[PDB]
């Protein structure tokens, strides 16, 4: 099982799934097995009836597509719809917090308010909307419509990547035509130039993904924004994470998925029912995180994390996983099957994201404490169905302290400079004590045994003196492996990096280090390391192409993290990616990708499937850029 | 070449493509058999970097995709996205007309401007933009700001759905949630809920694509809509199709592609040009159309039609072909690679629709008549290059009689009842000189051998006294085999058929019949065919469910044609589709699509590759209305 999953937990439930026959992704990933070359390489197109078409890699025909695409064009335009597909799910998430403030602020919907208010200011002066003389619901209104205006074409590009970004990267994108015009018309207009018979030239449908990729990033950027207003900028938290998080006694819920709209009053309406669960016989509601959901829950309340991404099905073998609580991205639809055989009561809760033979709750937001009761009370009856049956929760947790906005980062560094905060940071980059900085980003992959190149690569970098900052399921991989637990700092960290971390942590009265690797939560909270790192650009007076920074989407598999990936290139980063993506049936969009792209935007792909290699070219790649600063490495 | 193509003068240059090693979409279809099945039923699933996954249709694993994907959701999603880009594509040519018509009335365009005053008035009084007393100029950016307006999320539905479709259909649509909240909302929604982890229920997602393919009824009937502004609403006009309107001692230009922005420009200037032609030696320059563009031209100005879809390179095979100028959408890219041995100068006009190694002119509305002269100065050069070199154009063409908006329709009926005009087509559906009312829509596919299906069936639909009307590349088969030559009708049409043609085309001065087959226009414009239904509708008091009125997409190939298809069912129409889409691997879905769907919209697809049987299955689907409205068949 060692093979399958690095995780202990995950290995002990592979062997109960094992002994009672529940089938798992990684039996799904065995019987399909050998996989489509075709579709691996990218030389497959099912773009109109005629296909499907393919083209052999290398030997004889097919070397075209019926209509004349291309391999380079077919490469391209799947890449490209990979890339508006991730782009559509971010943005929908963006969107849909969008309408509930608006909700919020006008009254419709009592069970959210404004949380942050002073992040709301921060948003609208960075918006250009005045906030001088105006109540807060109006300034949030007003934010609320340019949130929404930015889906769609207006006098102004999308505002959540013209004023994110330092001014001198957007002059570098808009002398490329690569600023977006509207989230919502880029993804149409990739569709339409990827469509039979429309755009058939390699660059022009690259830069045109480029373009959809930043629109990806404006969408993290706008849930991030309006998430913070609505539920609070996450500050430094401890918690613990993996399934030992589960606990027979109480009603276990998970929050699974991305938008936290509906998840996060599930949190605090399941403290007010904690009578109503003991009167059942359970000691309480123990809501727990999966996957985005729940680390946006963990950033902001510290909720538990009991499992991410690959190994989702597990925490329902436990048998003690009395309901899963669904919105959309990243679900198995799977889970609504082992359901039967687990006993736990699977609840979708958004229109557009339903799974046959799950309980469909329709959550809206005038609703949502009573939608949270309905679907809490579900879960209390289910609790009381599992009365007398044994379950297998692995004892096995690790510590777990998060949080890491970059709010929160800002104020932590505050504390040994507080008016120039960034500049510790930049003194100890410069000195060698931090060599740069590695974002992980992205989820697992069933190709890759579970989290084995996130820590592969993290121990190499962390070793090596590199500041570490994950988001998604690679902080999820890393908290799991204990990267987040202060106490592991000796074992983990460079001496250079560990004196830093100490004497922040220290300055921020921890009596202790900062942890080894500052979990910047979700993955549209990618959007809070564009801040950081954006900030130390400014702070510079370079641009970000020159900074030592660089990204590792080390097991990536959603099309959402193909659009991280291509927007950290677009915005400057060298940026790994550790799964093939569909791309090697043509060398000149590879060489596009991981080469030429460097002389329009500074960044580029790294496509790098070994960890160790990986992480040489990684420590490569910011030596390069130190040296381009002119400094030692 | 028979067994490829059924036009005589496509096997013509067939012939000469072989003869010359030339390789067409024909031989480039050989090479690439047999095609794979699993993309052929539609089980096979490229969502996630986990993948491919494929299922078999029959047999042993693999039986589900790796996440837990049925086939049912594998299915439904791979369709829900090609619904998506074909909604992309007839929305941003719509999208791009109220560009032009809003930098137009601005004083920003001066090459354009509101032709058709008529047109506006009507279309500003359906949307509920007030006139009087108002400049048209004023009146026209009220329709272009409500016309960009649909494609995101407002206070209103997509007005351009709403508005066109009887209050009956619309409520039915609204019961169900089909009614679009927005045309690019749509779009990015679905590639949002097919996304990985995201909806997995075979009925939410295909209720799902339904909403999306009114979307694109919306981008088609705003399409017309604007053209017809910009360019004149069609009326009836006499030309000529086929290769043999080409002509040697000319300098042939064909326009090809969808929008007509810059191919009606393209129309006058050469008209202009006409001196500077000949001082090159030719007798003038010589407009011809390919695909929908031509449609375009031909329905407005009469400019004769070269040929259509599949055999879109045989055009430039005959050697007399001097420019090709694209714009967007059904353009084989081989065109840039066969112009090299052919001579011809092909051309790309817009951003995101480039060809690696056309030459690429960046056309703009300001500029337009500037970027014209340009583009023609090159095919004259051209038309210089091949002075001496011989030609072979088939001396092959067909009379075409088009023009056929529905306000032609309208008009040349009220010519036998001036104040109820429907009235004498409604007379002659009840007493069986009308049986019933068939669309011709859609593409060319190599797959069936070149309008075979589309004369198969119509021809036996003549006979049985149907009133065929047709769009797009069905229009093209039909013209190309002279269904459009009055000439033809006692050969083809049954004697009550017959009877109503002649009696309209009289009333009309034609001193004949009006032709076997009624031209509509481009694909946006089976929206002119929604117009004409929807009035029949209103007109007799039910809902278009009732009406003995089908559509066939009987050689469909585009994403397009899927999203037509799909909203032909989602208005109320028995539609076949004449060649296989990728559902056969679910019967689920094919069941919903093709027999339960009936109970949601009154719609369904008839799937049908046998065109003999097809046009059997149409007419017991239009005699079935028939009897529905107690009428004798
Ligand atoms: S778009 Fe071209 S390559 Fe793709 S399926 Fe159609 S014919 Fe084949
Ligand atoms: S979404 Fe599911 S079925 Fe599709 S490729 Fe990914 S794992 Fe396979
Ligand atoms: S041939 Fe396997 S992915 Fe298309
Ligand atoms: S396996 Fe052939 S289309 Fe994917
Ligand atoms: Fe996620
Ligand atoms: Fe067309
Ligand atoms: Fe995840
Ligand atoms: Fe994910
Ligand atoms: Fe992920
Ligand atoms: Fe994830
Ligand atoms: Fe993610
Ligand atoms: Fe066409
Ligand atoms: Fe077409
Ligand atoms: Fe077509
Ligand atoms: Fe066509
Ligand atoms: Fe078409
Ligand atoms: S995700
Ligand atoms: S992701
Ligand atoms: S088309
Ligand atoms: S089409």
Redesign the interface.
């Given at each position: 099982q060692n093979l399958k999953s690095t995780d202990r937990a995950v290995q002990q439930m592979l062997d109960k799934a094992k002994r009672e026959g529940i089938q798992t992704?990684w039996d799904?990933?065995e019987?399909?097995k050998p996989?489509?070359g075709?579709?691996?390489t990218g030389l497959?197109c099912?773009?109109?009836?005629?296909?499907?078409?393919?083209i052999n890699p290398f030997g004889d025909?097919?070397?075209?597509?019926?209509?004349?695409?291309?391999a380079?064009?077919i490469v391209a335009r799947?890449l490209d719809?990979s890339i508006?597909?991730?782009?559509?799910?971010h943005?929908?998430h963006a969107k849909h917090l969008a309408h509930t403030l608006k909700k919020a602020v006008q009254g419709k919907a009592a069970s959210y308010m404004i949380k942050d208010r002073t992040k709301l200011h921060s948003i609208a002066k960075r918006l250009g909307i005045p906030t001088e003389g105006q109540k807060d619901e109006d300034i949030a209104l007003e934010v609320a419509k340019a949130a929404?205006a930015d889906?769609?074409?207006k006098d102004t590009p999308v505002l959540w990547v013209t004023t994110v970004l330092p001014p001198s990267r957007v002059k570098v994108l808009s002398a490329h035509?690569l600023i977006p015009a509207?989230?919502?018309?880029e993804?149409?207009?990739?569709?339409?130039?990827?469509?039979?018979?429309?755009?058939?030239?390699?660059q022009?449908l690259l830069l045109?993904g480029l373009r959809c990729s930043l629109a990806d990033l404006a969408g993290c950027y706008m849930g991030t924004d309006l998430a913070d207003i609505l539920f609070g900028t996450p500050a430094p938290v401890v918690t613990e994470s993996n399934l030992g998080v589960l606990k027979a006694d109480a009603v276990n819920v998970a929050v699974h998925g991305h938008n936290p709209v509906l998840s996060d009053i599930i949190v605090s309406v399941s403290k007010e029912m904690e009578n109503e669960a003991r009167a059942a016989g359970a000691t309480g509601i123990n809501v727990v995180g999966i996957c985005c959901t729940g680390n946006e829950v963990l950033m902001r309340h510290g909720i538990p994390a009991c499992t991410h991404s690959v190994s989702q099905e597990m925490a329902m073998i436990t048998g003690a996983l009395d309901a899963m609580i669904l919105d959309?991205?990243?679900?198995?639809?799977?889970?609504?099957?082992i359901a039967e055989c687990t006993g736990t009561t699977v609840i979708t809760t958004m229109?557009?994201?339903?799974?046959?033979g799950a309980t469909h709750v329709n959550f809206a937001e005038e609703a949502a404490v009573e939608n949270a009761k309905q679907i809490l009370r579900l879960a209390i009856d289910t609790f009381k169905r599992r009365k007398g049956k044994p379950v297998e929760i692995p004892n096995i947790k690790t510590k777990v302290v998060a949080g890491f906005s970059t709010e929160a980062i800002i104020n932590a560094l505050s504390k040994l400079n507080a008016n120039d905060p960034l500049k510790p940071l930049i003194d100890n980059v410069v000195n060698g004590n931090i060599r740069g900085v590695c974002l992980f980003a992205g989820c697992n992959?069933?190709?890759v045994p579970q989290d084995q190149n996130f820590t592969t690569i993290a121990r190499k970098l962390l070793k090596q003196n590199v500041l570490v900052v994950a988001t998604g399921c690679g902080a999820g991989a890393l908290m799991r492996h204990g990267f987040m637990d202060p106490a592991n700092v000796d074992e983990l960290c460079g001496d250079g990096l560990k004196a830093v971390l100490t004497a922040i942590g220290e300055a921020n009265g921890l009596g202790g280090p900062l942890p080894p690797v500052l979990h910047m939560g979700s993955c549209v909270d990618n959007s809070r390391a564009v801040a950081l790192v954006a900030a130390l650009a400014n702070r510079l007076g370079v641009d970000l192409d020159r900074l030592p920074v660089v990204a590792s989407a080390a097991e990536?598999?959603?099309?959402?993290?193909?659009a991280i990936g291509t927007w950290a290139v677009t915005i400057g980063l060298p940026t790994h990616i550790g799964?093939?993506?569909?791309i090697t049936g043509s060398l000149p969009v590879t060489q596009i990708l991981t080469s030429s792209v460097k002389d329009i935007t500074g960044g580029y792909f790294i496509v790098e499937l070994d960890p160790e290699t990986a992480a040489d070219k990684l420590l490569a790649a910011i030596n390069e850029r130190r040296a381009g600063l002119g400094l030692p490495w």
């Open positions: 992704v799904r990933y019987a399909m996989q489509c075709f579709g691996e497959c099912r773009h109109c009836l005629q296909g499907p078409c393919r025909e097919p070397k075209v597509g019926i209509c004349g695409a291309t380079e064009v799947g719809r508006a597909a991730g782009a559509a799910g943005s929908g929404l889906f769609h074409e035509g509207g989230i919502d018309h993804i149409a207009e990739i569709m339409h130039r990827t469509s039979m018979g429309c755009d058939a030239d390699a022009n045109g959309y991205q990243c679900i198995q639809p799977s889970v609504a099957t229109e557009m994201s339903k799974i046959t992959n069933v190709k990536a598999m959603h099309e959402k993290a193909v799964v093939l993506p569909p």
